[PDB]
Amino acid sequence: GSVQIVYKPVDLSKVTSKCGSLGNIHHKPGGGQVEVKSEKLDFKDRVQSKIGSLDNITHVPGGGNKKIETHKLTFRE
Amino acid sequence: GSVQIVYKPVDLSKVTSKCGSLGNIHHKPGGGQVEVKSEKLDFKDRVQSKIGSLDNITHVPGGGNKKIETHKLTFRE
Amino acid sequence: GSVQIVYKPVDLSKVTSKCGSLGNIHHKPGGGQVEVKSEKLDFKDRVQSKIGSLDNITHVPGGGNKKIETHKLTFRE
Amino acid sequence: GSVQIVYKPVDLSKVTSKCGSLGNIHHKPGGGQVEVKSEKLDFKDRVQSKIGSLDNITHVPGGGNKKIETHKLTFRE
Amino acid sequence: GSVQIVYKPVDLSKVTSKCGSLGNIHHKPGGGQVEVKSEKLDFKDRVQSKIGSLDNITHVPGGGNKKIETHKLTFRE
Amino acid sequence: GSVQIVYKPVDLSKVTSKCGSLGNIHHKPGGGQVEVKSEKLDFKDRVQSKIGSLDNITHVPGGGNKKIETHKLTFRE
Numbered sequence: 347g348s349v350q351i352v353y354k355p356v357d358l359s360k361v362t363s364k365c366g367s368l369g370n371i372h373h374k375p376g377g378g379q380v381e382v383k384s385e386k387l388d389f390k391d392r393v394q395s396k397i398g399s400l401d402n403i404t405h406v407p408g409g410g411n412k413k414i415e416t417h418k419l420t421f422r423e
Numbered sequence: 424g425s426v427q428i429v430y431k432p433v434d435l436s437k438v439t440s441k442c443g444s445l446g447n448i449h450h451k452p453g454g455g456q457v458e459v460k461s462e463k464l465d466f467k468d469r470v471q472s473k474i475g476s477l478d479n480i481t482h483v484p485g486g487g488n489k490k491i492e493t494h495k496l497t498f499r500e
Numbered sequence: 501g502s503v504q505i506v507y508k509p510v511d512l513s514k515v516t517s518k519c520g521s522l523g524n525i526h527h528k529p530g531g532g533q534v535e536v537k538s539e540k541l542d543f544k545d546r547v548q549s550k551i552g553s554l555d556n557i558t559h560v561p562g563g564g565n566k567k568i569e570t571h572k573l574t575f576r577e
Numbered sequence: 578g579s580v581q582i583v584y585k586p587v588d589l590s591k592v593t594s595k596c597g598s599l600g601n602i603h604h605k606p607g608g609g610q611v612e613v614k615s616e617k618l619d620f621k622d623r624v625q626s627k628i629g630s631l632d633n634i635t636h637v638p639g640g641g642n643k644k645i646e647t648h649k650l651t652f653r654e
Numbered sequence: 655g656s657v658q659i660v661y662k663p664v665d666l667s668k669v670t671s672k673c674g675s676l677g678n679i680h681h682k683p684g685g686g687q688v689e690v691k692s693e694k695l696d697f698k699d700r701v702q703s704k705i706g707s708l709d710n711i712t713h714v715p716g717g718g719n720k721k722i723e724t725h726k727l728t729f730r731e
Numbered sequence: 732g733s734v735q736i737v738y739k740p741v742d743l744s745k746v747t748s749k750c751g752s753l754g755n756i757h758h759k760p761g762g763g764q765v766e767v768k769s770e771k772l773d774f775k776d777r778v779q780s781k782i783g784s785l786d787n788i789t790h791v792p793g794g795g796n797k798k799i800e801t802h803k804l805t806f807r808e
Contacts, residue, residue, distance in 0.1 A: 348502045351428045355494055356510045358435045363486020364518045366443045366587040366664050370525070375479035376454030377530030382475040384461050384538050389547045393466045396473050396550050398536040402529035403480045403557045407564030409517020410484030415492045415569045417509055422499050422576045443587050454530060475536075479529070484564070485519055520587070520664040520741050581658045589666045597674045608684030608761065615692050620701045627704050629690040633683040633760070634711050638718030638795070639750055640671020646723045648663055653730050658735045666743045674751045685761030692769050697778045704781050706767040710760040711788050715795030717748020723800045725740055731808050 353419060363409040373404050430496060440486040450481050507573060517563040527558050584650060594640040604635050661727060671717040681712050738804060748794040758789050 382398050389395060459475050466472060536552050613629050690706050697703060767783050774780060
């Protein structure tokens with residue numbers, strides 16, 4: 347029993363963004379309140395949690411192009 | 424029993440965005456309240472949770488092109 | 501039993517962003533309050549948590565292009 | 578009296594020529610005579626002149642694309 | 655009296671020529687005669703002149719792309 | 732009287748020529764005669780002149796791309 351595998355993906359792909367300008371951008375979020383009251387917190391076994399936040403963000407990329415690839419090859423016996 | 428596999432995907436694909444300008448953009452979210460009251464929190468076995476947030480975002484990419492590929496090949500016996 | 505594997509992915513991919521200008525950008529988030537009151541905190545077994553934050557961010561990349569690749573090959577017996 | 582002028586022409590123009598081949602080209606102009614007889618020549622005040630020529634030309638550009646722009650802004654008082 | 659001028663031309667223009675080959679090109683101009691007879695030549699005040707020529711040219715550019723721009727801004731008083 | 736001028740031309744322009752080959756090119760101009768007979772030559776005040784020539788040229792650039800720009804700003808009073 348002979349197994350022969352060949353894996354030749356050939357990728358010539360271009361992700362591009364030509365952008366003349368971005369210009370003025372104003373972010374004016376109003377002030378807020380986030381009150382939380384909890385008596386107990388028994389976190390365990392890979393628990394990820396957030397308890398109380400106010401997130402203000404201005405993410406402005408001059409081209410935010412994102413390319414994600416994933417190659418995977420699994421062989422058994 | 425002989426198995427012969429050939430894997431040659433040939434990709435010549437272009438994701439593009441030509442954008443003359445973006446210009447003025449105003450984000451003025453009104454202030455809010457997010458009050459939460461919970462007595463107990465027994466989180467376990469891969470639990471991901473958020474308890475109390477006010478998320479203000481301004482995501483402005485001059486070209487936000489996103490290309491996602493996934494190649495997968497599995498062989499058994 | 502002979503197994504022959506060849507792994508030749510050939511990638512000629514370009515992620516690019518041509519951006520004439522970014523210009524003025526104003527971030528004026530209003531002041532807020534994040535009061536949290538919790539009696540107990542029994543965290544264990546890989547627990548990651550945040551308890552009380554006010555996150556103000558201005559992430560402005562002149563080209564924020566992100567390319568992520570992952571090659572993986574697993575052989576058993 | 579206040580004058581405010583903004584001059585933002587945004588040009589994203591491409592002049593291109595894809596040409597597989599040019600190949601053989603033969604120029605065989607027959608010999609000629611250009612006899613001129615003039616008694617006087619009183620040239621003055623920016624006079625440009627040619628008196629007697631035989632012009633043989635072979636202008637072969639592999640892409641002779643020519644882009645000409647002109648921006649002009651004049652302000653008085 | 656206040657004058658405010660802003661001059662932001664944003665140019666992202668590409669002049670290109672992809673040319674697979676140029677190949678054989680033959681220029682065989684026949685011999686000629688250019689006899690000129692002039693008694694006088696009183697040239698003055700910026701006079702440019704040619705009196706008797708035989709011009710043989712072979713201008714072969716592998717891409718003869720020519721881009722010409724001119725920006726001009728004049729202010730008075 | 733206050734004058735405010737801003738001069739921000741942003742140029743991202745590419746002149747290019749991809750040329751696979753130029754190959755054989757033959758220039759065989761036939762011999763000629765250029766006889767000129769002039770009694771007088773009174774040249775003055777910036778006079779540029781040529782009197783008797785036989786110009787043989789072979790201008791072959793592997794890409795003869797020429798970009799010419801000119802920026803000019805004049806202010807009076």
